[PDB]
A paper describes a structure:
One SUMO-FKP-NTD monomer constitutes the asymmetric unit of this crystal. The part of FKP-NTD folds into two domains. The first domain (N1; 1–290) contains a seven-strand mixed-type β-sheet flanked by a four-strand antiparallel β-sheet on one side and a two-strand β-ribbon on the other side, plus 10 α-helices. The second domain (N2; 305–492) contains a three-turn left-handed β-helix, which is terminated by a two-strand β-ribbon and followed by a cap subdomain of a flanking β-strand and five α-helices. On the N-terminal side of the β-helix, some features of the electron density map suggested the presence of a bound ligand, which was modeled as a Hepes. Except for the sulfonate part, it had few interactions with the protein, suggesting a possibility of nonspecific binding.
The full-length FKP (FKP-FL, 949 amino acids) exists as a tetramer in solution, but the individually prepared N-terminal domain (FKP-NTD corresponding to the sequence 1–496, also containing a SUMO tag) and C-terminal domain (FKP-CTD, the sequence 519–949) form a monomer and a dimer, respectively. FKP-NTD has a single α/β domain and a β-helix-containing domain, whereas FKP-CTD folds into two α/β domains and the linker comprises three α-helices.
Author numbering: -78 to 97, 104 to 290, 305 to 492
Amino acid sequence: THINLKVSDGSSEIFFKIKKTTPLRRLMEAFAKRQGKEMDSLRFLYDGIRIQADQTPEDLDMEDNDIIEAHREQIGGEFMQKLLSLPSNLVQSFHELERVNRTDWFCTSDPVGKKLGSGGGTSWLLEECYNEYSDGATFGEWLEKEKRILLHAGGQSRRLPGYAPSGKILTPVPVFHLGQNLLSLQLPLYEKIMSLAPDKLHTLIASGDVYIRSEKPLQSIPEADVVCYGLWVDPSLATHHGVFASDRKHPEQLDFMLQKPSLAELESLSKTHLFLMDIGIWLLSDRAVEILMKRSHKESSEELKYYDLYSDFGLALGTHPRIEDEEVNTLSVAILPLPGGEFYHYGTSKELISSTLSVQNKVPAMFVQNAVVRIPLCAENADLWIENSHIGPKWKIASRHIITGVPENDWSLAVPAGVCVDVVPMGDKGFVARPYGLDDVFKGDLRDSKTTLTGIPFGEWMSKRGLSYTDLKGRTDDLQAVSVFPMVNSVEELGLVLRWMLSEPELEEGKNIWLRSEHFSADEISAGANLKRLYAQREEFRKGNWKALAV
């Protein structure tokens, strides 16, 4: 008495006739043989549990026309090196802070001076890695050796001040795994991809501020020189991103690239092309890497040049490139839709909150991590993110807040809706107070009424406190470089000055403190932050949160 069984890899289903008392070893071996691989490289699941190979259908009570799911399995084995472009202050400390070893993890920062872009940055990352792990080989020989995952996270993070000095990707994210952050949440996708990739694509490039997800298995990975992942997009969303346009009859090859097309330009091609949103996951062959790298160097001298991977290099790809490049155009290109692909941005504060809510609600918009909260919390306090902070019982809060870094205190601090509070350790014992607003973009000349601090015009913020531009040493063209935030040496002064910078501008001692305190811009904060004290405080809050009998 026999039974028919489907096995699905994610795309197709294939039927096996087998006797109910025959071990599945034969079936799994045959399915592995069919898909070129071998049974060791596959994971067969039925009902959700991983099954052995010496088990018979009668053992696990399966019936005719049932389906078993065959996922790939590249968990252990040859591990890829991670190359990070990070803020320079975090480079010195990343390995100690996250306790990873330098064999698996290399990082650097853009050199002090001019910026290099996505392409130039990638070239500098590959170069700085080779210069430390070459072991005598040449560059082309070194690149062949390992698969490597490169992450761009070295920008200024103007719109996410709470985690700019730690590069955004080191942000703790809750759950409702062990302890985890954005990077640890995202990296398994990159690792799975890079395992499934051919052994000629040795460099994955990830950039942007978008967390990518998918609950379905990946498709096979072509053997082009450039592979790019994307999501099928209607123009209503294509217009906001980089777009791969492909011919109607050729949904695999890349026709050309677009950087944020207009709604009309897309309607002008709606009959002749399909559109994929670039999600910032690329794979390059060694030849692609060499060509990108030489395009990231000058003509005569071979050193450094701003080169944009997506607007310079990228726009030169496809069968109908828009910008000319002799060598770049010769590279083949594959555009892969991400099966079950999902994307959630985290470049801005509002996005941190809403994206973590959306991601959590897949495997209520209030999030408390590594914190002591001494006030009650109800559904009126919606859109909340408290992390590495002590919220004393005399605080008054509302909704839409990001509170990060706040040391232990009994402050009577009121926090208006939409206002956020960040504290950043500085020096051996100081604290920089960085209040701001949920929609501050931290860009703009100070004399423009659209340039805001804590959601009100900067000039107004200055005049409510009796301050003039005479009290600001330095530039005023760009709020991100304006030294407004004071460094103080006590939690008392810290609370006094924070109150003064929010709802109590009449607090005289607050203004006195600010006037006698060193002033930091956001750039100087993320350039000088004492990350070790920030992590130490976070861990002390964790340890306190593990005291089971404490209320």
